[PDB]
């Protein structure tokens, strides 16, 4: 299964994240540094789709342009064959990881939904 | 806290719609009829105030003058006292209730936050 | 500045 971690942090996310039936859906929501600064985050959803041979690592990535201060997703998907992997390869300042699965032939999903909220006042 | 709740309707709003630490804000956006009209919404937000005494609700209606085809937005606030509720009682047509929490005096927050989708995203790939 | 302020009914 994909198990839910909330867990509390300088940087934290306000958009929900879901697994649903065909994979995970993150609602739109605001990226925080603390009391500090807040950056809109969009909404964004990716299927879970599994592969007939190989366990498949999807890893999503919560990254900003420095110049810009656009905050962005991308996802990784690997194939794992010994030599797939996911590792985030852009430019940007990686701010988070908040979806780490891997999804087996079969269909088993297993991994972790990042939920980080606010260190307490 | 406030829930999120997606779901594929013939009427739907492309308006992001979020909690801040203050309140609601719903974006500027586009109320579809299926695939037959859109029309513009625009953008709204409001203040979560609590109250000293009294626990609030809040209410967010998106209705339409079904002549002047105008979209617009009303919000009720209620105080959990035992004498009032909201309701949508106006002549325009009623075509979603997106946003409906209940703010405690200490600023729990309880409530949901209604997506409506098309029927029947895509992060960059970094790879 | 929308929202339109929509006041609640008395309950009875």
């Given at each position: 299964g994909i198990e839910i971690?909330?867990r509390k ?7 929900e994240?879901k ?7 993150v609602s ?8 500090e600064?807040v950056f809109?985050?969009e ?5 879970l789709t ?5 366990p498949?690592?999807?890893?999503l990535y ?34 988070m ?6 999804v ?5 999903r297993?991994g972790?939904i ?6 307490d006042r």
């Open positions: 971690v909330n942090a300088v940087w934290y996310l306000t958009s994240i697994e649903t039936e065909t994979g995970i859906e739109a929501g605001e990226l925080h540094k603390g009391d600064e809109p985050v909404e964004v959803s990716f299927d599994p592969d007939d041979t190989y498949v690592e999807y890893m919560l990254h900003m342009n420095v110049q810009t201060k656009k905050v962005s997703w991308s996802l990784c998907k690997a194939y794992l064959d010994g030599e797939g992997y996911c590792d985030y390869q852009g430019n940007e300042r990686l701010i990881y908040p979806v780490s699965v891997t087996f032939p079969n269909g088993t297993e972790t990042f939920l980080y909220e606010k260190e």
